Amino acid sequence: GSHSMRYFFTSVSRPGRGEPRFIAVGYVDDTQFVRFDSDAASQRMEPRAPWIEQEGPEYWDGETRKVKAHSQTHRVDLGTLRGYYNQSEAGSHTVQRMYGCDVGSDWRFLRGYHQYAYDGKDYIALKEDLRSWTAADMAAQTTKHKWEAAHVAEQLRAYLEGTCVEWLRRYLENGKETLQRTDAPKTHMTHHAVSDHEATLRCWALSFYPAEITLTWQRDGEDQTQDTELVETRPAGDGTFQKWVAVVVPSGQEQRYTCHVQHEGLPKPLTLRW
C-alpha cells in the first residue's frame, strides 16, 4: 500500500542559561529509524531501527551535520519569534517542525509537506502544490515574504519530490523484512457486569502494524455508536499497536452485538461475537 517518510523536530527554549532543548525523530511509516537529542552525550544522529545500521559512516556524518544545522535554525528562530511577538526573556517557548513525503502503492510521489508551529499554533506551512505558503498571522507573513525572496519553496520542492522519495524507496528496500510486512491484529472480546441489568463488552485489537485500524460495533447488523467508548491507538512498545472499543448493553442481549475489525493485514474484515 502507500508509504511515508516523516521527520519531527521540537526545540524548547531554556531562559536562564544556554541553548534550547532540541529533539529530532525520523520515521518510515509507523517505524522510528533515527533520533537526535541535544541532551544526549553522543551529539550524533543515532539509529533506532536495525536496517538503517546498513548505512555507512558518511551517512552518519552527513545526517549529524544536517541535524545540527536544523538545531541552529531553530535556536535562531526562537529569538526571532520572541522579537516578532514582543515577548520577554523570562518564559519558555516551543517551535515544532514536521516535513516529509508520501508515496502510493507504486512508490511514486504522491504528496509532500513542510509545516511549522510556534507555542503549539500554526505559524507557516508549505501548500499542497509545493509552490506557495500559508501564513497564519502577520509575523508569519513577514517570514513568507523572506522565503519568497530566497526561493525557499523551490529548494524544498526539489527535496520533497526528489531526495525524499528516492531515500524512502531505499529505506523500504533495505528494511523490507519488517517495513513491507503487515501484522494482522490479534482480536478477542471481554465481558464485565456493573449491575444485574447492565453489561460492558470490550473488543480488543492487539499486536498490529501499521497503526491504521478501524474498530466498530454493530447491533442486529446496524452500526452502533451510542453507548460506545473507543480508545486512542496506542504503541505496545515493541513496534506494534493496540486498540479497543467497548459497548454497554443490557445483560442477556450480548448476542445482538458484533465487533468489526478492518486492517490492511486482513484480506477481509473480521467479525467477533460474545
Binding site: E63, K66, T73, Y116, W147, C164, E166, W167
Partner: peptide, 9 residues
Amino acid sequence: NLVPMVAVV
C-alpha cells in the same frame, strides 16, 4: 535523509 538546508524564519 534530512533536507540539506533549513531557512531561518
